Amino acid sequence: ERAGPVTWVMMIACVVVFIAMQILGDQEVMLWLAWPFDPTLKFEFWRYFTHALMHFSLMHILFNLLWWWYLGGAVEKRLGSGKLIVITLISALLSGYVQQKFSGPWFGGLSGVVYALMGYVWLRGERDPQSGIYLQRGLIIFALIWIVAGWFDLFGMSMANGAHIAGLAVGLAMAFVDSLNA
């Protein structure tokens, strides 16, 4: 294998949601899973996280899940399921909060989490080399290209720039914090 349970369940969850979106249409699934877009939805607490389970395009779910499978899968195997859980919770929540602050609540997608994993794995490898986690030269070039693609919006639709900044920030900061230990 390769995929621990956290890596696996997120992939399954993104695929199931994506199917639901093809059947029902994107906005019907946004109605249930999006960041609260009405004051009356503020207590539906799953919404602060489930915006990360929705994808609007085949190419973005494929690349997000590929990066999640690789980096998420590495974090879980070398550092544990719980570490991947907390990275994911924190990046999904802070990236969603930053995204809706700048541009409102109609956003979705795992990249916020993917950007946190990229920054986490890269920085942790650079500072704490022999905890077993690092991003190889080649892959970080391709991560850097992916990041530049989103910043200059070389993609189909509008990019969630605040999600994307906040997620990377979360990842670098947690890697820094985890690097102080030894």
Partner: peptide, 4 residues
């Protein structure tokens, strides 16, 4: 709409 924004993608993430």
């Amino acid at each position: 709409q924004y993608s993430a």
